[PDB]
Design an enzyme around this catalytic site. Sequence first.
Site, PDB file in Angstrom:
ATOM      1  N   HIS A  61       0.806  -1.194  -0.087  1.00 44.78           N
ATOM      2  CA  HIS A  61       0.046  -0.076  -0.077  1.00 44.78           C
ATOM      3  C   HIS A  61       0.770   1.143   0.128  1.00 44.78           C
ATOM      4  O   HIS A  61       0.806   2.255  -0.768  1.00 44.78           O
ATOM      5  CB  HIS A  61      -0.813  -0.126   1.307  1.00 44.78           C
ATOM      6  N   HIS A  91       4.696   6.911   7.398  1.00 53.41           N
ATOM      7  CA  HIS A  91       4.633   6.339   6.130  1.00 53.41           C
ATOM      8  C   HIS A  91       4.080   7.579   5.527  1.00 53.41           C
ATOM      9  O   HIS A  91       4.002   8.658   6.034  1.00 53.41           O
ATOM     10  CB  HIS A  91       3.596   5.123   6.022  1.00 53.41           C
ATOM     11  N   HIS A  93       1.631   9.129   1.843  1.00 54.45           N
ATOM     12  CA  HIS A  93       0.688   9.047   0.647  1.00 54.45           C
ATOM     13  C   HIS A  93       0.955   9.760  -0.358  1.00 54.45           C
ATOM     14  O   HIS A  93       1.296  11.235  -0.071  1.00 54.45           O
ATOM     15  CB  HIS A  93      -0.786   9.269   1.142  1.00 54.45           C
ATOM     16  N   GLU A 103      -4.055  13.420   1.465  1.00 59.10           N
ATOM     17  CA  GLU A 103      -5.296  12.973   1.992  1.00 59.10           C
ATOM     18  C   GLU A 103      -6.302  13.992   2.513  1.00 59.10           C
ATOM     19  O   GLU A 103      -7.072  14.290   1.974  1.00 59.10           O
ATOM     20  CB  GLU A 103      -5.361  11.993   3.029  1.00 59.10           C
ATOM     21  N   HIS A 116       2.603  10.790   7.482  1.00 64.23           N
ATOM     22  CA  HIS A 116       1.792  10.381   8.572  1.00 64.23           C
ATOM     23  C   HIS A 116       2.644   9.770   9.658  1.00 64.23           C
ATOM     24  O   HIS A 116       3.235   8.656   9.531  1.00 64.23           O
ATOM     25  CB  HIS A 116       0.708   9.630   8.335  1.00 64.23           C
ATOM     26  N   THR A 195      -6.988   6.296   7.891  1.00 62.66           N
ATOM     27  CA  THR A 195      -7.623   6.425   6.422  1.00 62.66           C
ATOM     28  C   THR A 195      -7.468   5.221   5.374  1.00 62.66           C
ATOM     29  O   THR A 195      -7.742   5.247   4.283  1.00 62.66           O
ATOM     30  CB  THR A 195      -6.693   7.556   5.737  1.00 62.66           C
ATOM     31  N   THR A 196      -7.157   4.138   5.922  1.00 60.61           N
ATOM     32  CA  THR A 196      -6.797   2.718   5.479  1.00 60.61           C
ATOM     33  C   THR A 196      -7.613   1.825   5.915  1.00 60.61           C
ATOM     34  O   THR A 196      -8.020   2.030   7.452  1.00 60.61           O
ATOM     35  CB  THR A 196      -5.311   2.117   5.631  1.00 60.61           C
TER      36      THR A 196
HETATM   37  C1  LIG Z   1      -1.863   0.827  10.708  1.00 60.98           C
HETATM   38  C2  LIG Z   1      -2.136   2.262  10.193  1.00 60.98           C
HETATM   39  C3  LIG Z   1      -2.085   2.639   8.849  1.00 60.98           C
HETATM   40  F1  LIG Z   1      -1.957   1.763   7.750  1.00 60.98           F
HETATM   41  C4  LIG Z   1      -2.418   3.871   8.428  1.00 60.98           C
HETATM   42  F2  LIG Z   1      -2.300   3.920   6.874  1.00 60.98           F
HETATM   43  C5  LIG Z   1      -2.726   4.889   9.066  1.00 60.98           C
HETATM   44  S1  LIG Z   1      -3.331   6.588   8.797  1.00 60.98           S
HETATM   45  N1  LIG Z   1      -3.024   6.558   7.300  1.00 60.98           N
HETATM   46  O1  LIG Z   1      -4.356   6.808   9.193  1.00 60.98           O
HETATM   47  O2  LIG Z   1      -1.977   7.443   9.239  1.00 60.98           O
HETATM   48  C6  LIG Z   1      -2.671   4.625  10.670  1.00 60.98           C
HETATM   49  F3  LIG Z   1      -3.023   5.612  11.538  1.00 60.98           F
HETATM   50  C7  LIG Z   1      -2.392   3.208  11.006  1.00 60.98           C
HETATM   51  F4  LIG Z   1      -2.315   3.008  12.361  1.00 60.98           F
HETATM   52 ZN   LIG Z   2      -1.625   7.309   6.383  1.00 60.87          ZN
END
Ligand SMILES: Cc1c(F)c(F)c(S(N)(=O)=O)c(F)c1F
Ligand SMILES: [Zn+2]
Length: 257
Positions: A61, A91, A93, A103, A116, A195-196
């Site tokens: 992803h 990570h 996006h 996002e 993030h 968001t995933t």
């Molecule tokens: C395990 C996981 C994720 F894969 C993720 F994409 C996000 S996010 N995009 O909301 O930052 C998380 F908070 C999270 F805990």
């Molecule tokens: Zn994220």
Amino acid sequence: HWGYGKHNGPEHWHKDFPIAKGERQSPVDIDTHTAKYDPSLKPLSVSYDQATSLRILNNGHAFNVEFDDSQDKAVLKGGPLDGTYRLIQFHFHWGSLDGQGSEHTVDKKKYAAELHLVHWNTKYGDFGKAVQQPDGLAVLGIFLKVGSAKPGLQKVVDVLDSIKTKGKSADFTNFDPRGLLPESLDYWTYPGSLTTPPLLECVTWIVLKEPISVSSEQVLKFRKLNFNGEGEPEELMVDNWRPAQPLKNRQIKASFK
Ligand SMILES: Cc1c(F)c(F)c(S(N)(=O)=O)c(F)c1F
Ligand SMILES: [Zn+2]
Ligand SMILES: Cc1c(F)c(F)c(S(N)(=O)=O)c(F)c1F
Ligand SMILES: OC[C@H]1O[C@@H](O)[C@H](O)[C@@H](O)[C@@H]1O
Ligand SMILES: OC[C@H]1O[C@H](O)[C@H](O)[C@@H](O)[C@@H]1O
């Protein structure tokens, strides 16, 4: 499994994750004029001096840079948060072109990418328990725009060739996430979700107002990653972002007057 394509992307997720249509979903558009200064917010504390990065993983992803969260080595406190939240991973996006990828949006404007930094509330003992709680997680979100290079990102960029495909990982010790921050910690905050998938409604979002600048060459290397595994037909890892979701019965608060 879920993904970002036409046949398994955000518009399909609700069939296996019905909370996708829930009351507290993320991301959202941040209307800067409606967001209100909140005097009850305490000073935000990003304490990453002792962070211990371990590994970088292409999970099909995005890519995650993982941290040793077996102790309070790198924590987020203050602001809207009650207690201590421990950094577990970061990570990004990003888009197929510089005009999309974030996002969250700011007055509907899309940035080229969004970072993030994911943290879990230590009162719950483990990430898995934290994602059973309304205040289990705090995600620090940082927008990326394309301009000058971000020196503190280059180590990430340069390892991506070794994790091109889903399931590959590489050692990633001694990386300092402080080099990914902007100068200002001014922020917006609201309650939301992952968001995933599984889209769990556990997150206090803290989205910094000041973007970081990265170079075109840096983001182009993100776009050379693959969603697919080794040996399989190449599907470039691009446009791994969920669009903005309904704000519903929420208010966005600002840390700044
Ligand atoms: C395990 C996981 C994720 F894969 C993720 F994409 C996000 S996010 N995009 O909301 O930052 C998380 F908070 C999270 F805990
Ligand atoms: Zn994220
Ligand atoms: C074949 C297929 C889908 F059509 C789909 F919509 C999803 S979902 N709801 O998670 O996005 C899948 F995981 C999946 F494997
Ligand atoms: O009732 C007045 C209150 O309304 C709420 O929706 C706002 O968040 C507060 O800032 C305000 O003081
Ligand atoms: O800090 C993250 C990584 O940066 C560079 O790739 C270094 O060569 C490597 O030793 C380190 O793990």
